[PDB]
Amino acid sequence: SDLVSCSYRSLAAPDLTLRDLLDIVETSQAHNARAQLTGALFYSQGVFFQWLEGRPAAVAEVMTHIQRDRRHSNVEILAEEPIAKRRFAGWHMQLSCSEADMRSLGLSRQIVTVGRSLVADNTNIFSFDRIAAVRRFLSDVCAARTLAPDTPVEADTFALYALTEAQAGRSGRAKAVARLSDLLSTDPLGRLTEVEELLRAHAPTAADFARLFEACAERLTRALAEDRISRMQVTLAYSALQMALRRIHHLPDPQKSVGAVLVAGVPGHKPILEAALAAEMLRAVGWSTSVVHPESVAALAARLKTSRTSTLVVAPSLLEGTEQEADTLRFVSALRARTDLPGLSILVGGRLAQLPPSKLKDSGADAGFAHLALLPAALARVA
Ligand SMILES: Cc1cc2nc3c(=O)[nH]c(=O)nc-3n(C[C@H](O)[C@H](O)[C@H](O)COP(=O)(O)O)c2cc1C
Ligand SMILES: [Cl-]
Ligand SMILES: [Cl-]
Ligand SMILES: [Cl-]
Ligand SMILES: [Cl-]
Ligand SMILES: [Cl-]
Ligand SMILES: [Cl-]
Ligand SMILES: [Cl-]
Ligand SMILES: [Cl-]
Ligand SMILES: [Cl-]
Ligand SMILES: [Cl-]
């Protein structure tokens, strides 16, 4: 064989256009054709996935150029593996984007459309599940269209690919969450290294961390309810998780950003972990994010009229939920009263996000996210 594959994830320049994508595709088609490289490029919501395959030398050279490109950043290698045969034969470099992005760019082949519609807001689907699903889907479309070019492929076909990948990961993740919950319930600070190794193995991205934390959080909420652990124990666990999070994920603020967003806790609530997670997730998709823990409504009012950052995410506290709801209501309402800003957008999480959007209209919050990992998606809708 002696064929190798390399795949990465990167953050497209916030000002990326169709002309750019097309230039990339043409340059790549020409060069990959000469150098005997094949693969696919997937663009969705400011993010790139690329797969490249060929002889080692060819892949290395082209990656040397790509890594230095200025139309994307935060290039993260995902795989460098030997393959037995090409997954994208005949595709020197094929472009593909999501259905939503297809709408947003005004496109309708030859660009392979991927329908994320049915699975995008499914919190059981982890980041690597989505990556693998896109890979398998595109490789399959490549085979298919090699066999029958004029035979169209249903976009929402991708849904099944994603769901299947996630289901494959499900049991192992259940084990991880169980083991984790045990650690957090016993002595999470005495065994922080084990907590970290677990989190590092099962949560490659910040959104994955958030998924695990949501699962653990309902587990421990149950435990505390049944008086199986103490409040002090939940505090310990919370500290441990903050430390583990900072050790593992700590993205710098994107220099080229898609926009700016303020992440705040409700005064008295200390959504330290959840706000940190919110910031990591939003930074990972290209948002400039600031975390604020105000102790008054007026403070945040000041920071907002000073920042002119028209978007505010109220991070929920998923472990102090005795009175998170009415507190958040009062806080957001008050904020709206002290404010004179028609462009301001407010997003809310937690139990408040579980109410029907009629209540959301009634609330003064603009939109909700019933789960942390849904935050990026909820934000994009408002922007
Ligand atoms: C997301 C992305 C993917 C790219 N993929 C390839 C590729 O597969 N093959 C290629 O030759 N260039 C690719 N490029 C472009 C190169 O980084 C660079 O434009 C080119 O290789 C150097 O220009 P040159 O024609 O003067 O050598 C890609 C760029 C971006 C931003
Ligand atoms: Cl891969
Ligand atoms: Cl979509
Ligand atoms: Cl998806
Ligand atoms: Cl990802
Ligand atoms: Cl994973
Ligand atoms: Cl595959
Ligand atoms: Cl485990
Ligand atoms: Cl401890
Ligand atoms: Cl340990
Ligand atoms: Cl405004």
Side-chain angles (χ1 to χ4, degrees), residues 149-176:
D150 292 13
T151 308
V153 287
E154 162 79 33
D156 290 309
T157 307
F158 168 75
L160 192 59
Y161 283 61
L163 286 176
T164 298
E165 204 62 43
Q167 161 67 8
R170 205 167 58 124
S171 140
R173 292 176 180 114
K175 271 177 51 191

PDB file of all heavy atoms in Angstrom, residues 149-176:
ATOM      1  N   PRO A 149     -23.393   8.829 -11.467  1.00  0.00           N
ATOM      2  CA  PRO A 149     -23.204  10.277 -11.322  1.00  0.00           C
ATOM      3  C   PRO A 149     -24.529  11.025 -11.315  1.00  0.00           C
ATOM      4  O   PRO A 149     -24.745  11.907 -10.479  1.00  0.00           O
ATOM      5  CB  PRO A 149     -22.407  10.655 -12.576  1.00  0.00           C
ATOM      6  CG  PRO A 149     -21.855   9.370 -13.102  1.00  0.00           C
ATOM      7  CD  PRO A 149     -22.864   8.334 -12.748  1.00  0.00           C
ATOM      8  N   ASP A 150     -25.409  10.661 -12.240  1.00  0.00           N
ATOM      9  CA  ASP A 150     -26.693  11.335 -12.383  1.00  0.00           C
ATOM     10  C   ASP A 150     -27.749  10.795 -11.423  1.00  0.00           C
ATOM     11  O   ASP A 150     -28.944  11.021 -11.616  1.00  0.00           O
ATOM     12  CB  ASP A 150     -27.192  11.232 -13.827  1.00  0.00           C
ATOM     13  CG  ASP A 150     -26.342  12.034 -14.799  1.00  0.00           C
ATOM     14  OD1 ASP A 150     -25.236  12.466 -14.412  1.00  0.00           O
ATOM     15  OD2 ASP A 150     -26.777  12.230 -15.953  1.00  0.00           O
ATOM     16  N   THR A 151     -27.315  10.077 -10.393  1.00  0.00           N
ATOM     17  CA  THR A 151     -28.246   9.586  -9.383  1.00  0.00           C
ATOM     18  C   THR A 151     -28.030  10.325  -8.072  1.00  0.00           C
ATOM     19  O   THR A 151     -27.025  10.120  -7.390  1.00  0.00           O
ATOM     20  CB  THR A 151     -28.146   8.062  -9.173  1.00  0.00           C
ATOM     21  OG1 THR A 151     -28.244   7.400 -10.441  1.00  0.00           O
ATOM     22  CG2 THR A 151     -29.273   7.579  -8.272  1.00  0.00           C
ATOM     23  N   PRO A 152     -28.989  11.189  -7.722  1.00  0.00           N
ATOM     24  CA  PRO A 152     -28.904  12.149  -6.619  1.00  0.00           C
ATOM     25  C   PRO A 152     -28.973  11.482  -5.255  1.00  0.00           C
ATOM     26  O   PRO A 152     -29.643  10.462  -5.101  1.00  0.00           O
ATOM     27  CB  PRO A 152     -30.145  13.013  -6.828  1.00  0.00           C
ATOM     28  CG  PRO A 152     -31.123  12.087  -7.462  1.00  0.00           C
ATOM     29  CD  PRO A 152     -30.308  11.224  -8.378  1.00  0.00           C
ATOM     30  N   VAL A 153     -28.292  12.069  -4.275  1.00  0.00           N
ATOM     31  CA  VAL A 153     -28.284  11.531  -2.918  1.00  0.00           C
ATOM     32  C   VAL A 153     -29.052  12.421  -1.936  1.00  0.00           C
ATOM     33  O   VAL A 153     -28.854  13.636  -1.896  1.00  0.00           O
ATOM     34  CB  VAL A 153     -26.841  11.295  -2.417  1.00  0.00           C
ATOM     35  CG1 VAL A 153     -26.235  10.086  -3.114  1.00  0.00           C
ATOM     36  CG2 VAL A 153     -25.982  12.529  -2.654  1.00  0.00           C
ATOM     37  N   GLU A 154     -29.941  11.810  -1.157  1.00  0.00           N
ATOM     38  CA  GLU A 154     -30.724  12.536  -0.159  1.00  0.00           C
ATOM     39  C   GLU A 154     -29.829  13.084   0.948  1.00  0.00           C
ATOM     40  O   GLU A 154     -29.074  12.336   1.563  1.00  0.00           O
ATOM     41  CB  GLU A 154     -31.797  11.625   0.443  1.00  0.00           C
ATOM     42  CG  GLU A 154     -32.365  12.125   1.767  1.00  0.00           C
ATOM     43  CD  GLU A 154     -33.392  13.231   1.600  1.00  0.00           C
ATOM     44  OE1 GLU A 154     -34.133  13.213   0.593  1.00  0.00           O
ATOM     45  OE2 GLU A 154     -33.464  14.113   2.487  1.00  0.00           O
ATOM     46  N   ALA A 155     -29.917  14.388   1.198  1.00  0.00           N
ATOM     47  CA  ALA A 155     -29.075  15.046   2.200  1.00  0.00           C
ATOM     48  C   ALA A 155     -29.239  14.432   3.584  1.00  0.00           C
ATOM     49  O   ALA A 155     -28.256  14.170   4.278  1.00  0.00           O
ATOM     50  CB  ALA A 155     -29.374  16.538   2.250  1.00  0.00           C
ATOM     51  N   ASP A 156     -30.484  14.183   3.971  1.00  0.00           N
ATOM     52  CA  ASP A 156     -30.778  13.698   5.311  1.00  0.00           C
ATOM     53  C   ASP A 156     -30.349  12.248   5.523  1.00  0.00           C
ATOM     54  O   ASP A 156     -30.565  11.672   6.592  1.00  0.00           O
ATOM     55  CB  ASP A 156     -32.249  13.924   5.650  1.00  0.00           C
ATOM     56  CG  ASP A 156     -32.574  15.398   5.847  1.00  0.00           C
ATOM     57  OD1 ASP A 156     -31.863  16.067   6.629  1.00  0.00           O
ATOM     58  OD2 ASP A 156     -33.524  15.895   5.204  1.00  0.00           O
ATOM     59  N   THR A 157     -29.717  11.678   4.503  1.00  0.00           N
ATOM     60  CA  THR A 157     -29.050  10.387   4.623  1.00  0.00           C
ATOM     61  C   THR A 157     -28.001  10.433   5.725  1.00  0.00           C
ATOM     62  O   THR A 157     -27.756   9.438   6.408  1.00  0.00           O
ATOM     63  CB  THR A 157     -28.337  10.019   3.311  1.00  0.00           C
ATOM     64  OG1 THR A 157     -29.262  10.115   2.220  1.00  0.00           O
ATOM     65  CG2 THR A 157     -27.746   8.616   3.369  1.00  0.00           C
ATOM     66  N   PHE A 158     -27.383  11.600   5.892  1.00  0.00           N
ATOM     67  CA  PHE A 158     -26.321  11.786   6.874  1.00  0.00           C
ATOM     68  C   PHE A 158     -26.796  11.471   8.284  1.00  0.00           C
ATOM     69  O   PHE A 158     -26.019  10.992   9.119  1.00  0.00           O
ATOM     70  CB  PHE A 158     -25.794  13.219   6.811  1.00  0.00           C
ATOM     71  CG  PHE A 158     -24.899  13.586   7.956  1.00  0.00           C
ATOM     72  CD1 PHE A 158     -23.602  13.111   8.017  1.00  0.00           C
ATOM     73  CD2 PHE A 158     -25.353  14.413   8.967  1.00  0.00           C
ATOM     74  CE1 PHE A 158     -22.777  13.450   9.068  1.00  0.00           C
ATOM     75  CE2 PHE A 158     -24.532  14.759  10.020  1.00  0.00           C
ATOM     76  CZ  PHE A 158     -23.244  14.276  10.071  1.00  0.00           C
ATOM     77  N   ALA A 159     -28.074  11.743   8.534  1.00  0.00           N
ATOM     78  CA  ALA A 159     -28.660  11.583   9.860  1.00  0.00           C
ATOM     79  C   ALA A 159     -28.388  10.198  10.432  1.00  0.00           C
ATOM     80  O   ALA A 159     -27.955  10.059  11.583  1.00  0.00           O
ATOM     81  CB  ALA A 159     -30.148  11.840   9.806  1.00  0.00           C
ATOM     82  N   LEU A 160     -28.624   9.189   9.602  1.00  0.00           N
ATOM     83  CA  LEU A 160     -28.462   7.794   9.975  1.00  0.00           C
ATOM     84  C   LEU A 160     -27.002   7.476  10.279  1.00  0.00           C
ATOM     85  O   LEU A 160     -26.703   6.737  11.218  1.00  0.00           O
ATOM     86  CB  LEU A 160     -28.973   6.906   8.842  1.00  0.00           C
ATOM     87  CG  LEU A 160     -29.157   5.419   9.122  1.00  0.00           C
ATOM     88  CD1 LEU A 160     -30.136   5.239  10.262  1.00  0.00           C
ATOM     89  CD2 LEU A 160     -29.645   4.701   7.877  1.00  0.00           C
ATOM     90  N   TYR A 161     -26.100   8.041   9.482  1.00  0.00           N
ATOM     91  CA  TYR A 161     -24.663   7.889   9.692  1.00  0.00           C
ATOM     92  C   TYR A 161     -24.262   8.414  11.075  1.00  0.00           C
ATOM     93  O   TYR A 161     -23.582   7.722  11.856  1.00  0.00           O
ATOM     94  CB  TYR A 161     -23.889   8.626   8.587  1.00  0.00           C
ATOM     95  CG  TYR A 161     -23.856   7.906   7.244  1.00  0.00           C
ATOM     96  CD1 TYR A 161     -25.024   7.635   6.545  1.00  0.00           C
ATOM     97  CD2 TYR A 161     -22.659   7.488   6.688  1.00  0.00           C
ATOM     98  CE1 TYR A 161     -24.996   6.965   5.325  1.00  0.00           C
ATOM     99  CE2 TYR A 161     -22.619   6.822   5.474  1.00  0.00           C
ATOM    100  CZ  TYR A 161     -23.788   6.562   4.797  1.00  0.00           C
ATOM    101  OH  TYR A 161     -23.750   5.902   3.588  1.00  0.00           O
ATOM    102  N   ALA A 162     -24.714   9.627  11.383  1.00  0.00           N
ATOM    103  CA  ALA A 162     -24.406  10.244  12.669  1.00  0.00           C
ATOM    104  C   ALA A 162     -24.969   9.444  13.841  1.00  0.00           C
ATOM    105  O   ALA A 162     -24.258   9.145  14.819  1.00  0.00           O
ATOM    106  CB  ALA A 162     -24.920  11.676  12.709  1.00  0.00           C
ATOM    107  N   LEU A 163     -26.248   9.093  13.735  1.00  0.00           N
ATOM    108  CA  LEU A 163     -26.911   8.356  14.793  1.00  0.00           C
ATOM    109  C   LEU A 163     -26.229   7.015  15.042  1.00  0.00           C
ATOM    110  O   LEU A 163     -26.100   6.580  16.192  1.00  0.00           O
ATOM    111  CB  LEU A 163     -28.388   8.156  14.462  1.00  0.00           C
ATOM    112  CG  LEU A 163     -29.256   9.407  14.601  1.00  0.00           C
ATOM    113  CD1 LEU A 163     -30.686   9.118  14.165  1.00  0.00           C
ATOM    114  CD2 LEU A 163     -29.216   9.938  16.041  1.00  0.00           C
ATOM    115  N   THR A 164     -25.784   6.371  13.967  1.00  0.00           N
ATOM    116  CA  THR A 164     -25.149   5.061  14.078  1.00  0.00           C
ATOM    117  C   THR A 164     -23.804   5.184  14.787  1.00  0.00           C
ATOM    118  O   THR A 164     -23.468   4.374  15.664  1.00  0.00           O
ATOM    119  CB  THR A 164     -24.962   4.399  12.697  1.00  0.00           C
ATOM    120  OG1 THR A 164     -26.243   4.198  12.089  1.00  0.00           O
ATOM    121  CG2 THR A 164     -24.268   3.058  12.829  1.00  0.00           C
ATOM    122  N   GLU A 165     -23.046   6.209  14.414  1.00  0.00           N
ATOM    123  CA  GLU A 165     -21.770   6.467  15.069  1.00  0.00           C
ATOM    124  C   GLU A 165     -21.953   6.682  16.580  1.00  0.00           C
ATOM    125  O   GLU A 165     -21.297   6.024  17.434  1.00  0.00           O
ATOM    126  CB  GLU A 165     -21.123   7.685  14.431  1.00  0.00           C
ATOM    127  CG  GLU A 165     -19.624   7.737  14.592  1.00  0.00           C
ATOM    128  CD  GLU A 165     -18.925   6.569  13.932  1.00  0.00           C
ATOM    129  OE1 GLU A 165     -19.302   6.200  12.798  1.00  0.00           O
ATOM    130  OE2 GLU A 165     -17.992   6.024  14.557  1.00  0.00           O
ATOM    131  N   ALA A 166     -22.875   7.583  16.910  1.00  0.00           N
ATOM    132  CA  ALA A 166     -23.140   7.878  18.309  1.00  0.00           C
ATOM    133  C   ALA A 166     -23.556   6.626  19.075  1.00  0.00           C
ATOM    134  O   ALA A 166     -23.030   6.348  20.162  1.00  0.00           O
ATOM    135  CB  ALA A 166     -24.180   8.981  18.438  1.00  0.00           C
ATOM    136  N   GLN A 167     -24.475   5.852  18.504  1.00  0.00           N
ATOM    137  CA  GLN A 167     -24.927   4.642  19.176  1.00  0.00           C
ATOM    138  C   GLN A 167     -23.763   3.692  19.406  1.00  0.00           C
ATOM    139  O   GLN A 167     -23.709   2.992  20.417  1.00  0.00           O
ATOM    140  CB  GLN A 167     -26.043   3.945  18.396  1.00  0.00           C
ATOM    141  CG  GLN A 167     -26.250   2.473  18.760  1.00  0.00           C
ATOM    142  CD  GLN A 167     -26.780   2.259  20.172  1.00  0.00           C
ATOM    143  OE1 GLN A 167     -27.138   3.208  20.871  1.00  0.00           O
ATOM    144  NE2 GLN A 167     -26.843   0.996  20.592  1.00  0.00           N
ATOM    145  N   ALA A 168     -22.822   3.669  18.471  1.00  0.00           N
ATOM    146  CA  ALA A 168     -21.641   2.843  18.667  1.00  0.00           C
ATOM    147  C   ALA A 168     -20.866   3.305  19.903  1.00  0.00           C
ATOM    148  O   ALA A 168     -20.352   2.480  20.646  1.00  0.00           O
ATOM    149  CB  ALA A 168     -20.758   2.849  17.433  1.00  0.00           C
ATOM    150  N   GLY A 169     -20.795   4.614  20.139  1.00  0.00           N
ATOM    151  CA  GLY A 169     -20.081   5.098  21.324  1.00  0.00           C
ATOM    152  C   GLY A 169     -20.818   5.052  22.669  1.00  0.00           C
ATOM    153  O   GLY A 169     -20.217   5.227  23.759  1.00  0.00           O
ATOM    154  N   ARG A 170     -22.126   4.805  22.600  1.00  0.00           N
ATOM    155  CA  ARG A 170     -23.007   4.994  23.760  1.00  0.00           C
ATOM    156  C   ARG A 170     -22.678   4.206  25.039  1.00  0.00           C
ATOM    157  O   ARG A 170     -22.605   4.786  26.127  1.00  0.00           O
ATOM    158  CB  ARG A 170     -24.459   4.758  23.362  1.00  0.00           C
ATOM    159  CG  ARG A 170     -25.457   5.467  24.248  1.00  0.00           C
ATOM    160  CD  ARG A 170     -26.842   5.452  23.618  1.00  0.00           C
ATOM    161  NE  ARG A 170     -27.312   4.093  23.351  1.00  0.00           N
ATOM    162  CZ  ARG A 170     -28.453   3.588  23.814  1.00  0.00           C
ATOM    163  NH1 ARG A 170     -29.257   4.332  24.563  1.00  0.00           N
ATOM    164  NH2 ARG A 170     -28.790   2.338  23.527  1.00  0.00           N
ATOM    165  N   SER A 171     -22.494   2.895  24.916  1.00  0.00           N
ATOM    166  CA  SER A 171     -22.232   2.042  26.076  1.00  0.00           C
ATOM    167  C   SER A 171     -20.973   2.450  26.844  1.00  0.00           C
ATOM    168  O   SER A 171     -20.985   2.592  28.079  1.00  0.00           O
ATOM    169  CB  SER A 171     -22.102   0.587  25.633  1.00  0.00           C
ATOM    170  OG  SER A 171     -21.057  -0.056  26.341  1.00  0.00           O
ATOM    171  N   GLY A 172     -19.885   2.625  26.099  1.00  0.00           N
ATOM    172  CA  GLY A 172     -18.622   3.044  26.672  1.00  0.00           C
ATOM    173  C   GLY A 172     -18.794   4.354  27.399  1.00  0.00           C
ATOM    174  O   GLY A 172     -18.295   4.524  28.524  1.00  0.00           O
ATOM    175  N   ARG A 173     -19.515   5.286  26.774  1.00  0.00           N
ATOM    176  CA  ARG A 173     -19.755   6.557  27.457  1.00  0.00           C
ATOM    177  C   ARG A 173     -20.563   6.390  28.753  1.00  0.00           C
ATOM    178  O   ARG A 173     -20.309   7.080  29.742  1.00  0.00           O
ATOM    179  CB  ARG A 173     -20.397   7.578  26.520  1.00  0.00           C
ATOM    180  CG  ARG A 173     -19.451   8.016  25.426  1.00  0.00           C
ATOM    181  CD  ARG A 173     -20.118   8.946  24.445  1.00  0.00           C
ATOM    182  NE  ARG A 173     -19.187   9.358  23.402  1.00  0.00           N
ATOM    183  CZ  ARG A 173     -19.314   9.033  22.120  1.00  0.00           C
ATOM    184  NH1 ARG A 173     -20.358   8.305  21.730  1.00  0.00           N
ATOM    185  NH2 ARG A 173     -18.408   9.446  21.234  1.00  0.00           N
ATOM    186  N   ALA A 174     -21.518   5.467  28.753  1.00  0.00           N
ATOM    187  CA  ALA A 174     -22.295   5.185  29.957  1.00  0.00           C
ATOM    188  C   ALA A 174     -21.396   4.695  31.094  1.00  0.00           C
ATOM    189  O   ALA A 174     -21.570   5.087  32.264  1.00  0.00           O
ATOM    190  CB  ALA A 174     -23.391   4.155  29.657  1.00  0.00           C
ATOM    191  N   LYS A 175     -20.443   3.831  30.742  1.00  0.00           N
ATOM    192  CA  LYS A 175     -19.447   3.366  31.703  1.00  0.00           C
ATOM    193  C   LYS A 175     -18.633   4.544  32.249  1.00  0.00           C
ATOM    194  O   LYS A 175     -18.414   4.662  33.463  1.00  0.00           O
ATOM    195  CB  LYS A 175     -18.503   2.358  31.051  1.00  0.00           C
ATOM    196  CG  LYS A 175     -18.969   0.914  31.134  1.00  0.00           C
ATOM    197  CD  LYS A 175     -18.005  -0.020  30.407  1.00  0.00           C
ATOM    198  CE  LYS A 175     -16.566   0.219  30.858  1.00  0.00           C
ATOM    199  NZ  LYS A 175     -15.577  -0.491  29.996  1.00  0.00           N
ATOM    200  N   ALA A 176     -18.196   5.414  31.344  1.00  0.00           N
ATOM    201  CA  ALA A 176     -17.371   6.548  31.728  1.00  0.00           C
ATOM    202  C   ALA A 176     -18.112   7.465  32.693  1.00  0.00           C
ATOM    203  O   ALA A 176     -17.566   7.880  33.708  1.00  0.00           O
ATOM    204  CB  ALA A 176     -16.919   7.311  30.502  1.00  0.00           C
TER     205      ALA A 176
END
